[PDB]
């Protein structure tokens, strides 16, 4: 059984250097033709190939990132390290390392290369955020209005993830939509949480927001304005 | 470099259907192509290697064929765990490219979004910033287009949006879009509009308000 696991800092600041380690078990980087590669996935985006290294020590890099990447192996520790320099916000992504089989051999003679055509086992992935923010609590603002009515709370400018939001201390669940946060160009996150109700219920509505990282709890009652 | 184009980018289906996803390369990649299935929150999982070989431990409903520039993955009888995003990967040329992915989600009947526009709170305005949010609630299919207009000027580069995951009961999606402006710029205009295009809407729907109107 082959397993891989990524480790490194979850947060990194722009211009800094990011070092990611892939520790694995079940194979050796001294085994014939084996490879270990790195692939990344920005939130909501497609997979992007970064680099790969083989047991005979040949290395290859994405041409678009070549100047900022270094991949290396430590055979005796069963680890592969990928160093990315000068990171910027667009480098925020989940980073995965993965195993690539070498050709099948028969009495130590390569006879099948078809198994090298895939990365067959992947690590769970490590989420890396690139932002220059210091920890900071959200500002919470009201969002106020088939014949459904909508209202919500805008949880703005906080760092880092995550934040939790519930409605009426947990009693309101139907019609609730808490969207995934977006990382603003400022380096702070922002999210909305809304709830749809029969245009008659306008019943009280309060969003309970909690950002553990900054010890910031807020309950904000939201109503249909006009005094 | 080499381009790998997946089709369709998104696809709706139901348990028991037969689906086929295709991947086309800009130059021939021989048989060096792999297919993966990735479920939300998890790493991609190898299904098919070398264009058509079934990876060990992978269920037989998955099949891959083709070589050169055109490949296809077919799942013969879709199971619930197959609602996911699929990717193809080429390994003939460096860099070892991935296709754009194809999202496979639960099919349901077309539903237009209920749209709502929220002006910025007076509380936010006092801090100097103005957030205008637009909500597209419970729609299907997933693709939707939101266009912000301020006093009829098309907005660009000053909004961000996020979409919920498919609802497990509804099978619909919801989308939140935030337009952000300084309090000053905000004050220099009156009509804030959120224009929405979607398959379930005969023509675009616009929700708006005039700033400061009381």
């Amino acid at each position: 059984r082959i397993t891989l696991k990524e480790s490194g800092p979850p947060l990194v600041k722009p211009t800094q250097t990011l070092t990611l380690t892939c520790s694995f078990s079940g194979f050796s980087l001294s085994d014939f033709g084996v490879g270990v590669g790195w692939i990344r996935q920005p939130p909501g985006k497609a997979l992007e190939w970064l680099a790969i290294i083989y047991s005979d020590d040949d290395k290859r890099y994405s041409p678009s990132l070549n100047t900022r990447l270094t991949i290396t192996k430590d055979t005796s520790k069963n680890q592969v390290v990928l160093v990315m320099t000068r990171v910027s916000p667009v480098d925020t992504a989940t980073y995965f390392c993965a195993h690539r089989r070498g050709p099948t051999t028969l009495f130590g003679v390569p006879i099948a290369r078809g198994p090298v055509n895939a990365m067959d086992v992947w690590g769970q992935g490590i989420t890396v955020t690139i932002s220059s923010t210091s920890t900071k609590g959200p500002s919470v603002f009201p969002l106020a209005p088939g014949a459904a009515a909508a209202l919500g709370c805008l949880v703005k400018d906080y760092f880092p993830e995550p934040v939790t939001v519930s409605w009426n201390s947990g009693a309101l669940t139907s019609g609730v939509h808490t969207f995934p946060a977006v990382l603003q160009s400022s380096g702070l996150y922002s999210l909305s949480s809304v709830v749809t109700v029969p245009s008659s219920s306008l019943q009280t509505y309060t969003c309970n927001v909690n950002h553990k990282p900054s010890n910031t709890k807020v309950d904000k009652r939201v109503e249909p304005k006009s005094c | 470099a080499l381009q790998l184009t997946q089709s369709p980018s998104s696809l709706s289906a139901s348990v028991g259907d037969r689906i086929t996803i295709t991947c086309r390369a800009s130059q021939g990649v021989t048989s060096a192509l792999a297919w993966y299935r990735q479920k939300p929150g998890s790493p991609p999982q190898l299904l098919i290697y070398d264009a058509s070989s079934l990876e060990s431990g992978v269920p037989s409903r998955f099949s891959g064929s083709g070589s050169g520039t055109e490949f296809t993955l077919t799942i013969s009888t879709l199971r619930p765990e197959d609602f996911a995003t699929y990717y193809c990967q080429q390994l003939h040329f460096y860099p070892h490219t991935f296709g754009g992915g194809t999202r496979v989600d639960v099919r349901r009947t077309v539903a237009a979004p209920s749209v709502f526009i929220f002006p910025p709170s007076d509380e936010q305005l006092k801090s100097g910033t103005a957030s205008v949010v637009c909500l597209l609630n419970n729609f299907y299919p997933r693709e939707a287009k939101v266009q912000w207009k301020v006093d009829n000027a098309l907005q660009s580069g000053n909004s961000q949006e996020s979409v919920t995951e498919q609802d497990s009961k509804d099978s619909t999606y919801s989308l939140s879009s935030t337009l952000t402006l300084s309090k000053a710029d905000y004050e220099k205009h009156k009509v804030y509009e959120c224009e929405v295009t979607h398959q379930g809407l005969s023509s675009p729907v616009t929700k708006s308000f005039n700033r400061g109107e009381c």
Binding site: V116 | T30, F93, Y94, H96
Partner: peptide, 7 residues
């Protein structure tokens, strides 16, 4: 260029 195992 071509993959490690191409050709």
């Amino acid at each position: 260029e071509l993959d490690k195992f191409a050709s």
